[PDB]
Structure 1
């Protein structure tokens, strides 16, 4: 598999894949006899794990540590669980912040005859 196929399969863009390699977050790709990057299922799983971990909120470092745990046959599921529960609490806080913004925008809108919205924001 070349990087194009990997992008199509993982949904990640070529830039992101290269970015993760540059950051040393994934097992480096191999080079073909021609000098071009080739990958294996191992790279796909690692990249897939990275794409999904980012989607849920883990920063770059956290996501990479998740890749390390994935590659470690002697991993402790307790460590993955602890990191996940910590991530959940963060998402709860993020949810609360958005609900606060939503509450404010709705209070303004309901006060608007359709302007209390612009006068109060300004």
Structure 2
């Protein structure tokens, strides 16, 4: 498979794919007779893991580490640890959003909601 095939299959652009290689986040593909990158199923799995990990919350570095763990013959407990930590991270984010949502709704309920200039929302946000 050439880089265009991988882009189509993974949904990643060829630039993003070259980027992942450039940052050593994935295994470097070998070169064909004419010098073009040749990809294997392993590359597809690494790029998929990278794309999906990101989509579910892991950042670049974290995603790169998951790829590292993936290629390792040997870490169920470890990956679980990383995953549960991601969950805790997301829950704190959910908690913060919920808090801001409730603060806005408390202010909104206090708002005259009319043509008067008096506004608790603006006054308490500034």
TM-score interval (norm. to shorter) = 0.7 to 0.9
Q: What are the equivalent positions in structure 2 for 1:88-107 lying under 5 Å apart? A: 88-107=87-106
Give the Cα separation in 1 of the matches to 2:39 and 2:112.
59
Shift of 1:28: 0.7
Change in 2 beyond 3 A, CA 1:13/1:119: farther
Give the Cα separation in 1 of the matches to 2:26 and 2:103.
42
Shift of 1:118: 4.4
Change in 2 beyond 3 A, CA 1:13/1:104: farther
Moved more, 32-41 or 65-74: 32-41
Shift of 1:24: 0.4
Shift of 1:105: 3.1
Give the Cα separation in 1 of the matches to 2:109 and 2:34.
64
Q: Structure 1 residue 121 and structure 2 residue 121: aligned?
A: no
> CA RMSD of the aligned region, Å?
1.9
Change in 2 beyond 3 A, CA 1:43/1:100: same
- Name the structure 1 match of 2:76: 77
Give the Cα separation in 2 of the matches to 1:5 and 1:110.
55
Shift of 1:116: 5.0
Shift of 1:7: 1.5
Structure 1: tracts of 5 or more residues without a match: none
Count residues with an aligned counterpart. 121
Q: TM-score when scaled to structure 2?
A: 0.82
Give the Cα separation in 2 of the matches to 1:38 and 1:80.
29
